[PDB]
Scaffold this active site. Structure first.
Site, mmCIF file in Angstrom:
data_model
loop_
_atom_site.group_PDB
_atom_site.id
_atom_site.type_symbol
_atom_site.label_atom_id
_atom_site.label_comp_id
_atom_site.label_asym_id
_atom_site.label_seq_id
_atom_site.Cartn_x
_atom_site.Cartn_y
_atom_site.Cartn_z
ATOM 1 N N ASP A 1 0.816 -1.211 0.000
ATOM 2 C CA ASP A 1 0.000 0.000 0.000
ATOM 3 C C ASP A 1 0.863 1.281 0.000
ATOM 4 O O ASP A 1 2.084 1.223 0.166
ATOM 5 C CB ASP A 1 -0.884 0.013 1.233
ATOM 6 N N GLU B 1 -0.335 -0.179 -4.727
ATOM 7 C CA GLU B 1 -1.130 1.026 -4.777
ATOM 8 C C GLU B 1 -0.185 2.239 -4.672
ATOM 9 O O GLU B 1 0.529 2.398 -3.674
ATOM 10 C CB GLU B 1 -2.167 0.999 -3.653
#
Ligand SMILES: OC[C@H]1O[C@H](O[C@H]2[C@H](O)[C@@H](O)[C@@H](O[C@H]3[C@H](O)[C@@H](O)[C@@H](O)O[C@@H]3CO)O[C@@H]2CO)[C@H](O)[C@@H](O)[C@@H]1O
Ligand SMILES: OC[C@H]1O[C@H](O[C@H]2[C@H](O)[C@@H](O)[C@@H](O)O[C@@H]2CO)[C@H](O)[C@@H](O)[C@@H]1O
Ligand SMILES: OC[C@H]1O[C@H](O[C@H]2[C@H](O)[C@@H](O)[C@@H](O)O[C@@H]2CO)[C@H](O)[C@@H](O)[C@@H]1O
Length: 587
Positions: free
Chosen positions: A278, A317
């Site tokens: 992330d 991400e």
């Protein structure tokens, strides 16, 4: 072989000449003497001191009589000269909060990745991910308790499988102290949270997902430095792991081994099939804006995985248009296989949010995704970030009364599942939860109790979308190749009808058509490429999903009538606020 530091550091069972026990290692170059304090010691830091190695900085010692199941810790005097009781940073198992003592367990046997699980990760496979927070998926009724790993094995696994998902994706199972970090603020990188049972229970869970033919993706957080319970900071009185706001020292060679080890660990001792990083933006920013050593860490890690555990993949991400996140290091770099398509999520949601009467002015929100589709290997994600903190549920973004909300949401999933790039869907979305996600409660399964209702409708659709998406190669073979997608109707803004074709390697195409206003379109003629007999295989307006059941109600043959620059055409019914997919019938 300095890649798997977890195979040597931390607590490992061993036997020094007939007598067995566990040999401990750590790694605090500076420190100032360190001993081992466990249940074998009466917890007394004077009985067992550890001999330091000068070159490696690793304090070591072989205690006999100390066996698996016993808690322990490290009592050290730090550079400053202070008393400290540290947790083993290579703890494979920790104790129930509160709140540290490492546990003597060893390494899980080790999992060879199967051919079929590797196949499931490839760019040509259908990949449909069910994203889940293990602490809020379901709870027991009496007490509101977590389901354990084994209960999740009996329930989460059969469910995601039946719903037709290919991958299960877990929010971080890192030992973490606050339920509210969702696992994003870890304190024990090598221990699965004790919240749901033992590490062997976690392992059983993963075995069960595999036994059901699911791949498992783990949220990996080598980018959020531990910030609780003084778990990793100033390890030996110095800035051993961090820097002179706490951020890993990806440059120091042992910190790197630590993080890369961690990845190899999950994939090799648990059989994890892929990892997701992330917030990549905040790892590489803040010599230019860029943190050059953090960029190198990711490039390197990806290379090492690609070499050590080929078949496992990584996804990322990243919140700025950093070029080539999912492109090879010799070039752009980063070297991830897959990227979250955040731009798409925002554009399509902004589109769906509009009063349908205004969609004619924002057509570019649905078409734009194609222009940059071949710059990255994309996943289309409706994830947990989008349904907390006042953002609303996905259902609740939809305009109009309830029946138009559900219809919009159905049409959207239809579109999403046909549009290039893999699929990610966060639990609760599949049955259209009304409320936001609450990590502190079960999902609203009570929405599915009683007579068949609009929530069952969506749940059936998502299932049929997955199974149908997996069945036909065109929907999934060539996401990343221009050949795999072509517009039939890109410029019907005034009616908000969009139509494209998806195509497999053999040149078979499925027609995907969406009508995003509530006005039914009858005798809508558009140009096609493969004349013949066409039939619906998917219709979001089916009564099976509590649609009005409009559509073409049979095979429809093309006409030799030019339309949209093509020689042959179909003249179809397009149900209102719906998408449909058609296949060509062999003759
Ligand atoms: O921002 C760059 C670009 O965005 C917009 O162009 C849009 C086009 O107007 C629209 O036709 C469509 O482009 C598609 C092509 O027509 C199609 O044949 C295929 O090759 O790719 C596109 C599919 O998305 O969509 C784009 C994006 O909305 C904007 O209007 C332009 O001025 C601008 O150059
Ligand atoms: O189509 C995108 C690009 O991705 C692939 O490269 C992968 C590679 O397989 C991995 O080793 C790792 O480094 O990720 C890379 C992408 O970041 C394809 O192999 C390549 O052909 C393709 O251009
Ligand atoms: O988690 C399983 C449980 O879900 C439902 O009850 C939930 C409710 O929907 C939530 O909003 C919240 O109140 O927690 C409840 C359970 O703790 C179902 O109604 C129930 O049957 C189901 O087992």
């Amino acid at each position: 072989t300095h890649l798997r530091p977890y195979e040597t550091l931390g607590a490992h069972a061993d036997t020094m000449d007939g007598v067995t026990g566990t040999r401990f290692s750590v790694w605090a170059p500076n420190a100032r003497r360190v001993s081992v304090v466990g249940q074998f010691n009466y917890w007394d830091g004077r009985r067992h001191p550890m001999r330091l190695r000068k070159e490696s900085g690793i304090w070591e010692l072989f205690i006999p009589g100390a066996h698996n199941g016993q808690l322990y810790k490290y009592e050290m005097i730090d550079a400053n000269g202070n008393l400290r009781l540290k947790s083993d940073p290579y703890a494979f198992e920790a104790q129930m909060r509160p709140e540290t003592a490492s546990l003597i367990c060893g390494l899980p046997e080790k999992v060879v990745q199967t051919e079929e699980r590797k196949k499931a990760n490839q760019f040509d496979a259908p990949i449909s991910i069910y994203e889940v927070h293990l602490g809020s998926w379901r709870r027991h009724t009496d007490n509101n308790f977590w389901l354990s790993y084994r209960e999740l094995a009996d329930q989460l696994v059969p469910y995601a499988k039946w719903m037709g998902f290919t991958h299960l994706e877990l929010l971080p199972i890192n030992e973490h102290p606050f339920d509210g970090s969702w696992g994003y603020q870890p304190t024990g990188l090598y221990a699965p949270t004790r919240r749901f049972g033992t590490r062997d229970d976690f392992r059983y869970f993963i075995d069960a997902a595999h036994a059901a033919g699911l791949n498992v993706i783990l949220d990996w957080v080598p980018g959020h430095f531990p910030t609780d319970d003084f778990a990793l900071a100033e390890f030996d009185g110095t800035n051993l792991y961090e820097h002179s706001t706490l951020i890993y020292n990806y440059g120091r060679r042992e910190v790197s081994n630590f993080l890369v080890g961690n990845a190899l660990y999950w994939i090799e001792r648990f059989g994890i099939d892929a990892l997701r990083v992330d917030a990549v933006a905040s790892m590489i920013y803040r010599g230019g804006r860029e943190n050059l050593e953090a960029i190198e860490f990711l490039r390197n890690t990806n290379r090492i995985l690609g070499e050590q555990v080929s078949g496992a993949v990584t996804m990322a991400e990243e919140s700025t248009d950093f070029p080539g996140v999912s492109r090879p290091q010799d070039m752009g770099g980063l070297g991830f296989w897959y990227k979250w398509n955040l731009g798409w999520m925002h554009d399509t949601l902004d589109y769906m949010k509009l009063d349908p009467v205004y969609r004619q002015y924002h057509h570019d929100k649905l078409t734009f995704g194609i222009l940059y589709n071949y710059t990255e290997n994309f996943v289309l994600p409706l994830s947990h970030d989008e349904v907390v903190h006042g953002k609303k549920s996905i259902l609740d973004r939809m305009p109009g009364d309830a029946w138009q909300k559900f219809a919009n949401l159905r049409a959207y999933y239809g579109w999403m599942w046909a549009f290039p790039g893999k699929k990610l869907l966060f639990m609760g979305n599949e049955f259209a939860q009304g409320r936001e996600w609450n990590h502190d409660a079960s999902l609203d399964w009570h929405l599915l109790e009683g007579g068949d209702n609009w929530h069952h409708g969506v749940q059936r659709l998502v299932r049929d979308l997955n199974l149908t998406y997996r069945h036909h190669k065109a929907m999934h073979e060539l996401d990343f190749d221009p050949y795999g997608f072509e517009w039939l109707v890109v410029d019907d803004k005034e009616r908000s009808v969009l139509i494209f074709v998806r195509r497999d390697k053999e040149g078979n195409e499925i027609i995907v058509a969406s009508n995003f206003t509530p006005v039914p379109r009858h005798d809508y003629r558009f140009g096609i490429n493969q004349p013949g007999k066409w039939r619906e295989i998917l219709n979001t307006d089916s009564m099976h999903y509590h649609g009005s059941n409009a559509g073409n109600g049979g095979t429809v043959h093309s006409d030799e009538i030019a339309s949209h620059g093509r020689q042959h055409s179909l003249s179809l019914t397009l149900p209102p606020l719906a998408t449909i997919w058609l296949v060509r019938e062999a003759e």
